[PDB]
Amino acid sequence: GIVEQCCTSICSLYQLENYCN
């Protein structure tokens, strides 16, 4: 999930926006 994706390498705003509903 988001934790796997973004807690070791920084996620961009674009990447984060993937987790908006």
Partner 1 sequence: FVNQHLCGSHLVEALYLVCGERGAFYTP
Q: Which residues bind partner 1 (CB under 8 A)?
A: 1-3, 6-13, 16-17, 19-21
Report the nearest approach of partner 1 to the CB of residue 3 (Å): 5
Report the nearest approach of partner 1 to the CB of residue 4 (Å): 9
Report the nearest approach of partner 1 to the CB of residue 10 (Å): 5
Burial per residue of 1-21, b for 16 or more beta-carbon CB atoms within 10 angstroms, e otherwise: eeeeeeeeeeeeeeeeeeeee
**Of 10, 7, 8, 11, whose CA–CA distance to 20 is shortest?**
11
